[PDB]
Amino acid sequence: MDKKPLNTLISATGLWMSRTGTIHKIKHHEVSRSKIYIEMACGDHLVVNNSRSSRTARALRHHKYRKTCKRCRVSDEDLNKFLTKA
RNA sequence: GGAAACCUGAUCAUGUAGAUCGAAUGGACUCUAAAUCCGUUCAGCCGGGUUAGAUUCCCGGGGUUUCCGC
Ligand SMILES: [Zn+2]
Predict the structure, then answer these.
(1) How many A from CA of A14 to the centre of ligand 1?
(2) Which residues crowd ion ligand 1, with CB under 5 Å?
(3) Which residues share a beta bridge with A30?
(4) What are the contacts of A24-31 at 24+ separation with CB within 8 A?
């Protein structure tokens, strides 16, 4: 499993995973320089580094999650898309 | 010029989903206050190796500190 920058990982899945292991659905994301600006379906906005070595990058290279965000309304199809990356 | 240690909100830790703090935000409560609490969110400086799996081990870059040297 090659270690790519975070924007590649969310570009492939369309999903975000928070520090609590919660999956959110990405509504918008945009890169600027080394930052990513992200807007979830549930309304949360966040600004992170576009690192290939971050904690959330490690989570997105793996296939586990603790819970899905209710307000994001993640479909079983998208969740399954995340679980079967390989 | 050379050696060692460490790494970007803070302190610490770390091969099988790191932690605590702090901050942003929503709510509860409240008197549409303060205080308090709860939910949500925020991480590995960069570029590679190795690995089933790495912020974590190895190499390199950059930076900081300490130490050695014309
Ligand atoms: Zn959400």
Answers:
(1) 12
(2) A 24, 40, 42, 69, 72
(3) A37
(4) A24/A69, A24/A72, A24/A74, A25/A69, A25/A72, A25/A73, A25/A74, A25/A78, A31/A7
Q: How wide is the angle at C-alpha A80 spanned by C-alphas A45 and A55, nearest 5°?
A: 45
Note the resolution in Å, 1 decimal: 2.3
Tokens read off for A54: 């971050």
- Quickly tell me which residue has 């679980």 as its tokens: A83
Q: Which nucleotide has the shortest C1'-to-CA distance from A57? A: B44
Helix H or strand E segment including A12: helix A6-13
